[PDB]
Amino acid sequence: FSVAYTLAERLIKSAKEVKQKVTVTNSSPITPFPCSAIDFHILYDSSGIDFDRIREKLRPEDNTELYNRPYVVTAAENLSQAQGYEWSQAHSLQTLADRVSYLRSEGKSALPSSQSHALRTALYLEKNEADAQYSLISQRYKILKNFAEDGENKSLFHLENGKYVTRFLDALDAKDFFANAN
Amino acid sequence: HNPYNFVPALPRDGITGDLGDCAPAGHSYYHGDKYSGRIAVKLTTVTPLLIPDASKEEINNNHKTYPVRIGKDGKPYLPPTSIKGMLRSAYEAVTNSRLAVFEDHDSRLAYRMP
Amino acid sequence: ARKVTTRWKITGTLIAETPLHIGGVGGDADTDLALAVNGAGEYYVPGTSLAGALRGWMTQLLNNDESQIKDLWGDHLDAKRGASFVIVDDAVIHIPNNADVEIREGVGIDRHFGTAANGFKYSRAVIPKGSKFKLPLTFDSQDDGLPNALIQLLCALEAGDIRLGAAKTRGLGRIKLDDLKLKSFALDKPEGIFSALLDQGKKLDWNQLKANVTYQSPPYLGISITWNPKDPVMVKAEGDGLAIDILPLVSQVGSDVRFVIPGSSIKGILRTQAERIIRTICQSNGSEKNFLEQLRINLVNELFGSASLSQKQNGKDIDLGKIGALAVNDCFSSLSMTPDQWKAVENATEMTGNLQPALKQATGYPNNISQAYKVLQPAMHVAVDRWTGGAAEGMLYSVLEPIGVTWEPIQVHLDIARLKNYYHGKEEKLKPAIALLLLVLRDLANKKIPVGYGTNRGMGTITVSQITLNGKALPTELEPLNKTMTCPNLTDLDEAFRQDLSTAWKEWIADPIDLCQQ
Amino acid sequence: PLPTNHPTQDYARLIEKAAWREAIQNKALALASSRAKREEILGIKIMGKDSQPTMTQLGGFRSVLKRLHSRNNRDIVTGYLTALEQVSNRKEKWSNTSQGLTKIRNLVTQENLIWNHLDIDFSPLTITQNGVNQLKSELWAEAVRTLVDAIIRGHKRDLEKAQEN
Ligand SMILES: [Mg+2]
Ligand SMILES: [Mg+2]
């Protein structure tokens, strides 16, 4: 527990970065706009637990990071008058929760696990190779139009602050950690 | 008589039932209404029959001589493919199916002015 | 450390009795399924893969008893047990001289149209038959002597009852042990501990242990079908040739190549007829189903096996997958050719020219082509255009028909223990599965199941001369199976037995439940 | 680099081939992804719903290239192309390609050409002295097979898109 709580102290600091990217317009000194956000992990490890190692080990290329993980839970309506609105929409938890439903949707999987893991492997390559593998698949599985992020249905990556970033790997990680008694 | 003639391929637009185009019965199970099994057939020659073995052909001055094709038991080996194409084309004719083998035939043919 | 009364080094040569495939992570640009290679790129058997094959067989021997298996192979859960006493090393595979890794093509045939299903084309690299690797076992005995179950294991290896790697039901994976050697080090004592360091150990006569035990082979029914081709039987080679477009498939078998019908092909024709029988009885159509759903029908799911497929069928989560209780071997020709003798056939370029020397060589009639062409005969075919006659432009092709290649008897192995486990022990439930299998064999002998390429195009029809049924340890009500049959209609099986099977079969037809549903 | 006499030179060579093989595989995936590059490298192209040549013609070539285990097998692949080129109906199947039969003839018979299309900087992937020239000669046939395999796959799965419009 003492190790796992030290992560939660570091994850809260990442979630709490919204306190700088979404701000009340023309406030000065600039005040964070009220926005609620999550960051989460899912360890799958026995020892190491360094947030910095954890997050750089899935930032495989200098242009690319495989996580969109500081997710805004505030409704898009409340945020629409803050600065950083478009940023908050790219980071909205509903994007992750929607993508998880598509993975979970079905007498057989809409996107097979067999194919999700082909994409997963390619994401660790250069973006050119990652997009190459998606283009081998993107028309075989019509659900993949929903996982695209380019606005062209040809990449799982969208540009963000000059980086390339994806929700696809967060959705595969969190797929089984979106259960509710409701 | 010219040694060939033609049986007319009537156009089949608006044909119905089993003579028409239809989804095939398929191979998954024996249909209760449709017949399956073995037919035994005898084929007897009337004029002599050529079964030339192009593997054993001999060439002199560019002329090709063919022996008869023989089986492992030394009798003439009539190929099932030769019987199948005989029947298939005879079947297409009297059933008036599509023609199975039409080459492209998409060039304008040429003639000569008188 | 761990106390050890004696360390046994148990070693010998394992030989591939049929082609092996131990898979790596998969894909290699040359094939879809790719062999495991060690860090030096050498082909090898991972000790994990071999250790699991051995532990698996012991578990089937000890009737899935955990308690004894964990005392050899170790455990993680029980506070008393931990690490394994049997140690299995990695063993590099030495492929025969000049031989090389073969690629086996595979296709799935749509059960409705009778043609290759879309996407179901694959290829597998396989280690050729007769390849060798070292048996690399060590056993750290804490008691005195050697466990009898570990002696039964070594007897089973020498009997060739263990299969290793992939596609075990479809031709691959059989291994047999030769040259077993046992070295004992009495690590409990000074004379023994220095022997480990210097003297290289104490020999044991295996025959003295092999004399103190009876090898208990598990229930199985072996089926040997003796057959000859009535029309040329071949499986097509992987790609078009030069002088001949369509050439037979061949495989290395030690010093020589032989024509081969893969067990994948013989299994697939048998499965297809078994399903057609079941669907016919139920009048269940196959046309609306995709190929993975077409395959999945009753009894054949147990005999021929089913794909792994997890399902949350009832809030409970269950796997639909099970291995085939029925396995089939590759069938090779009696005729054989040196590897270069066939390379002369693959690389002939004139059907009437340099091809004729090559076939005279390979057929074994180097001076007598009219006998050579009673074994392998080139055929030419034309498509004839329907308006003009003659031949359709481009549509000329040729086949090397193995009109006279003689073939060895097909071996089918039915694992009665594996079915009986699927049916949770109830030997009453075998009779519908045994009834189905005998109906499939009845059609095979009646020319209803053609084999290989071109079955509708002048090839593939077989004459069956004899089916020999040879089961071991069969349950007493199936004991009448042990027979040699020569009537195609099974009339050599006792009428009371055929009438019993007919009764259990008819009772299943009247209600075709999932027979392994407890 | 390791000195040529160095004892671990044999072990370094195992590591290099692994780093080269994965580099070639990754680069071949990227180059197949773009229709201009498949056309540059093999001349293959998509024209409406049609494939140039038919996928069957690509498949036939590919089956022969499977036999290209070594440079001394390039006789096998060039032999196929000359027999193809000698039959008029088969040669014209590859008309409306961008020179495809010569481009294949070149890729198989010019030993430098595969490496110029892959265009990989191997300097970060080698540690043995004289490693680059050795590994190029060893992995040549595998690179040709990998690149042709990738291009035909990428072609077919773009052909499926133009087909499905
Ligand atoms: Mg593959
Ligand atoms: Mg030819």
Coordinates of C-alpha atoms and ligand atoms in Angstrom, one line a residue, chain C residues 241-243 245, ligand 2:
Chain C
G241 CA 6.5 -25.2 -62.3
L242 CA 8.4 -24.7 -65.6
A243 CA 7.8 -27.6 -67.9
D245 CA 2.5 -26.2 -64.1
Ligands
MG2 MG 5.5 -23.4 -69.7

